Symmetry: C4
Amino acid sequence: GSWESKFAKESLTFDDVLLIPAQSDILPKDVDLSVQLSDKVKLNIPVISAGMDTVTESKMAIAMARQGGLGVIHKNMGVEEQADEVQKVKRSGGLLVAAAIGISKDTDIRAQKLVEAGVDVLVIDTAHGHSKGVIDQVKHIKKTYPEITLVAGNVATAEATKDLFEAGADIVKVGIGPGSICTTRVVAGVGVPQITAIYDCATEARKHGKAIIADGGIKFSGDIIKALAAGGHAVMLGSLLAGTEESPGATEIFQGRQYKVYRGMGSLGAMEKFVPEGIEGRTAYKGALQDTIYQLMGGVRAGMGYTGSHDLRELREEAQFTRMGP
Amino acid sequence: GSWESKFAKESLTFDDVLLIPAQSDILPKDVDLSVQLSDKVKLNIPVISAGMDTVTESKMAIAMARQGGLGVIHKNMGVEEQADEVQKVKRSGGLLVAAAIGISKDTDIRAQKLVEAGVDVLVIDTAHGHSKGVIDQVKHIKKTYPEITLVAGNVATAEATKDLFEAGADIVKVGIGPGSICTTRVVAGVGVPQITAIYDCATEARKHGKAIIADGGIKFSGDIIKALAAGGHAVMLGSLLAGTEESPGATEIFQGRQYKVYRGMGSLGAMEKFVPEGIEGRTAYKGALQDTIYQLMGGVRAGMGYTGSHDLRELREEAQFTRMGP
Amino acid sequence: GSWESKFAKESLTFDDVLLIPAQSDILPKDVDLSVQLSDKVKLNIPVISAGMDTVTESKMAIAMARQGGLGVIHKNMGVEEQADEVQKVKRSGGLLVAAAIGISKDTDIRAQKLVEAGVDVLVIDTAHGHSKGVIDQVKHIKKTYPEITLVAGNVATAEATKDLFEAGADIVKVGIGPGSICTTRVVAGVGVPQITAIYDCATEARKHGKAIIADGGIKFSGDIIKALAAGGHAVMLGSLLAGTEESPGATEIFQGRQYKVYRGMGSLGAMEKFVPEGIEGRTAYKGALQDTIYQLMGGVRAGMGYTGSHDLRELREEAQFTRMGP
Amino acid sequence: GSWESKFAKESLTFDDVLLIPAQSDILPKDVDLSVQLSDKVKLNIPVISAGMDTVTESKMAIAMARQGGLGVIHKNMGVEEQADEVQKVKRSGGLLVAAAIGISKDTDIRAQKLVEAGVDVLVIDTAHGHSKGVIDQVKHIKKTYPEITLVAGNVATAEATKDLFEAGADIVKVGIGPGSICTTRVVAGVGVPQITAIYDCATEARKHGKAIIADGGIKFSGDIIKALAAGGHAVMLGSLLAGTEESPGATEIFQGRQYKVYRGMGSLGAMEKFVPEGIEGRTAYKGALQDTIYQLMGGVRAGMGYTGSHDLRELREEAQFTRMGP
Ligand SMILES: C[C@H](Nc1ccc2ncc(CO)cc2c1)C(=O)Nc1ccc(Cl)c(N(C)C)c1
Ligand SMILES: C[C@H](Nc1ccc2ncc(CO)cc2c1)C(=O)Nc1ccc(Cl)c(N(C)C)c1
Ligand SMILES: C[C@H](Nc1ccc2ncc(CO)cc2c1)C(=O)Nc1ccc(Cl)c(N(C)C)c1
Ligand SMILES: C[C@H](Nc1ccc2ncc(CO)cc2c1)C(=O)Nc1ccc(Cl)c(N(C)C)c1
Ligand SMILES: O=c1[nH]cnc2c1ncn2[C@@H]1O[C@H](COP(=O)(O)O)[C@@H](O)[C@H]1O
Ligand SMILES: O=c1[nH]cnc2c1ncn2[C@@H]1O[C@H](COP(=O)(O)O)[C@@H](O)[C@H]1O
Ligand SMILES: O=c1[nH]cnc2c1ncn2[C@@H]1O[C@H](COP(=O)(O)O)[C@@H](O)[C@H]1O
Ligand SMILES: O=c1[nH]cnc2c1ncn2[C@@H]1O[C@H](COP(=O)(O)O)[C@@H](O)[C@H]1O
């Protein structure tokens, strides 16, 4: 019964696992990092920048797309403002671009202006995607724009993933509570350790033949490959990209050291009724996006070389982990 | 045998678990936070302030009741003094009030004056409620005042809970060793990690159709919902409320920062023969009770929205957890 | 096979367990703390001070015996010097006294002078008691002095305990690696977490009807009751008693704060060929032995009151624990 | 299936285990520390210094060999430079010496000059030895020089070990990610906790009757004996030897304290395309190699005395561990 199964489940995070090295005949420089997210969207690297007001606006989306990745333009701005940012990305050599939409009544206006601006992928981005509001919005957006790649989230269970894909989503975004600036676990007591959330959701996605985005909690390149090997098609980054020059914030100095503001979309500052679910902090200035992406992808290339993985499909389907203690 | 089963049991604390998000068609603002503790006592929020000399006197009991909660007037004062505090709460618009009683010979005098003062709930509050002294006091108080709501504790086992409810208690208070200022675990080597203590005691309480109060160890709003989802009908708070303006202590300044004194009822200072079982410390001034209660209940509302819980009964009976490592 | 069973065993320390509260009809002040170590030796409290040059000489042995406990005069001094210390203890009202002996060739001379001085218990104290040298010394000492209570150690296994009791030891002392100043685990990679070491050794001792001393790793009163409840008849203390006025060292001041020197018997300073197995450090001045013993025994009394244990036999045979995470 | 077994494996590190003390009739001074690595190579102590530019050049290889150990001359220098270092070691009384070779095209030239210089053991040292490049190099080196002792690595699995021994390696070197200066786990998300890596690889090596070198992650003498007892024939040290006078770096002063530079062979500084897999740091000056080796071997002697191990073979085949928590 439900009473008896209350504590049956046990879950794993990035720090609980390591990839086991395997027979390899490939050098890190020769591995294939490309991923087919939908029949219309292919990325050259499995990295997506987060739809956050301290992470992705036009500058970040352009630089990400230039590296073979993707940017999610945040929705904490006017509808025409969001459309204008998408337009600049499209004007920068026809680069791919994504944009976040909600479930509020203004969504129909927002979705229309973004599609008119040339957006390639719409992201129904909510704190809790296993809801009637999200499922109905997935159906409406897919019915209205059947030629637009649709991401829906955030989820952390197989049942939620099944419901989003069945409602018409092309991609399901995974992550309830793992974020660096996230206080969801502390404030609401809810969450699923990210490695188990990815694995459970990817187990379901394999039945549908559709992709998942592993969103949140990635601290280093090692966590990227672990996220992909657990079942994620691509990863979403907030913290690792917030300190780059290309993020929306201004570079400020403090006691001789340069910093950039990084905040949760559920923080008081971002929300300006709901109690905060994110913090506002200062992160070290990391220089250009180009440098950070190269170091992170180099780490992924090393791990694929250790696992004998020629491409991401082989890494997802064959790579093995070991569990460990602290 | 007893020798062979010495280390069979394994227990969980708040930090070992998280609630799993589920299908939801309800917004945090629309969830129902009310709880029926007894046929005569209904709270609008599942929060009770602790019977401690640095937490609850008339001011705290009035503010708590005003928020839909309850206050437990501490017994570390004269019998007529305790009766006077209850009287002020009753004079403040007929608000609900509780008062702590012991097992000492002066209890008959104390219980009579509190009942005459209009007390709604008597709390037989001891460090160890699974005792002959407590069970006999439960029988006596219930026989003398059958119209008064009776809480008895503290316990951490199913057998203890069964014995207290069978002796005539309406509500059983759960918590042996989890408190913030508590040194019971360190000093006496006794205790049950609070999530397992709640679950084991609520498993028994379900058979009797009676309520349990999850007492101690709550550090944030996330721990409140975890305490309720593990089986608690309401939670008891010490640390989270000690820094509010409404607590009995005076606001003192230290190096430009404001603080309030918070101490265990088993500390040297509070006890003024038994060796101390609590510490005396300084806690950050948090301002008004009203602000702290709103932030804590907002966090509970978010978690119920993630779990799809419309009310606390559904959260207790259906919500699922996951276990995790450090 | 031995290869396949290399990592089969799993062990518990003090910090992994807590005692479960049980039905109680006894107040902490009324519990019985006495223990029958041998037909000739009964203690009023289950506490023995360690045979260490920074813990027990005549002053500590007198004060310990006065509290109902026992002191082990260390052997890092001349044979006649050790005999002189035992003599002072016996001259102080016929109080009980113990003295440490080794396995070296000078032991016959040392054992004779200590017995002539009126020693009640001889302690064959070695870093590794599961050895041919110790077993032969047990046989020799018991054959020579059949009327003297004989302790032999240190061990951490059932097979070792069985071998020491069968060789003629009356009491087996348990503890390989748990000490506060001990570097045995770090230096030699050997040890058994103390709760499992006590339990495994007490499981064997129950078959022989003989006592065990739980030696090392006790940081607070809570660890004392856990040590006894896991199967120990009495506990041995080093760290908790080193800072008392009665320990052999002189009280020294450092930046306005008083300290006492505490060192392992395997430290460079104590040993003055073997590489050190203990450190030399400064511990906080705790005042009189009388005060420390009262606080520690008060904590034990509280735990026995929570467990419903009237005496130590009931605590050893019936008390139950719960395991927990960090 | 591969999908279902993704998280089946669980692994142990040095800090998760302790050796269980056993029946002993041997003193630490009388234990035998010698090991037969190949029919041509016998060491008097089971210690090999690492092939790193901050650990082993001629000075370290001479001192190590003088203690009964072995040094691995690093390959981050000219072919004739490496040959010159080997020559100095051979000129110092015919002491044993080892030298590292890669899988690059210049290897044939390097291997020939080292063999001509009198090298006793060639070490095919790579970050990932379970590769086509390494296996082919093992075959080539063994075919060319059948009279030279050949080490191949690094590996962490039974299948990898089997493949290296079958290709013709005499000794397999174990260690993927455990190093002190190693960022492989963090950067590439790959690794096997070292105790399990040794055990799994030694399980396979027992079938072939060949030796394994436990490489990396040893912080103290206790970790050396644990590494050997888990199945390693000898251990390889980097961190523990980097601070000795005999290491290639120069002794530098910082705020009155002496330090030596210690860096990973995958650090930016050492590599001077691949992203770094090691850090560059300052380690405390430990004085002479002779002193450090004596303290480390003394600790190993103590542990063998506790386990009753007369020699390393008995320690590998019979010694038992216990698992524990943090
Ligand atoms: C204040 C908080 N803010 C955010 C903002 C962005 C987020 N982005 C991702 C995640 C995933 O942990 C959580 C987030 C929370 C938030 O929206 N809570 C929240 C909690 C429960 C429910 Cl049912 C809902 N529904 C969407 C109404 C919203
Ligand atoms: C000194 C200590 N003080 C307190 C005071 C308030 C407490 N309130 C709650 C809890 C729960 O950990 C413990 C508390 C200990 C205390 O009463 N110990 C204590 C220990 C064991 C037993 Cl059997 C008893 N019985 C009631 C006689 C009392
Ligand atoms: C240096 C060290 N010193 C001490 C001194 C007192 C101790 N007292 C207790 C314990 C228990 O961890 C260890 C101790 C180590 C020590 O004696 N090691 C040691 C290690 C292994 C063996 Cl087989 C032996 N045998 C007695 C010859 C001695
Ligand atoms: C940059 C790094 N540097 C080093 C250098 C020395 C090392 N020595 C030992 C270990 C074992 O963790 C790792 C090391 C990494 C390195 O070589 N990575 C690396 C990663 C994956 C593969 Cl498949 C390969 N193959 C040999 C081409 C190399
Ligand atoms: O305030 C917030 N609360 C909880 N999660 C958040 C919040 N803001 C953003 N997130 C999530 O955290 C991710 C960033 O994770 P990070 O890379 O670990 O910093 C975003 O992509 C969101 O899914
Ligand atoms: O001195 C004490 N020792 C042990 N527990 C205490 C003491 N004083 C109060 N408590 C308990 O700790 C609770 C407060 O827990 P907190 O909210 O974690 O601070 C109270 O409601 C009591 O049940
Ligand atoms: O140098 C040493 N190495 C290891 N154990 C030691 C040493 N000296 C004393 N011990 C043990 O540690 C105990 C004291 O433990 P403590 O009370 O945790 O400080 C003594 O009774 C001895 O059994
Ligand atoms: O940069 C590096 N990355 C990873 N492992 C390294 C690196 N450099 C050396 N190692 C390994 O780490 C070992 C030294 O380990 P340590 O004794 O724990 O410092 C060497 O013998 C190598 O196997």
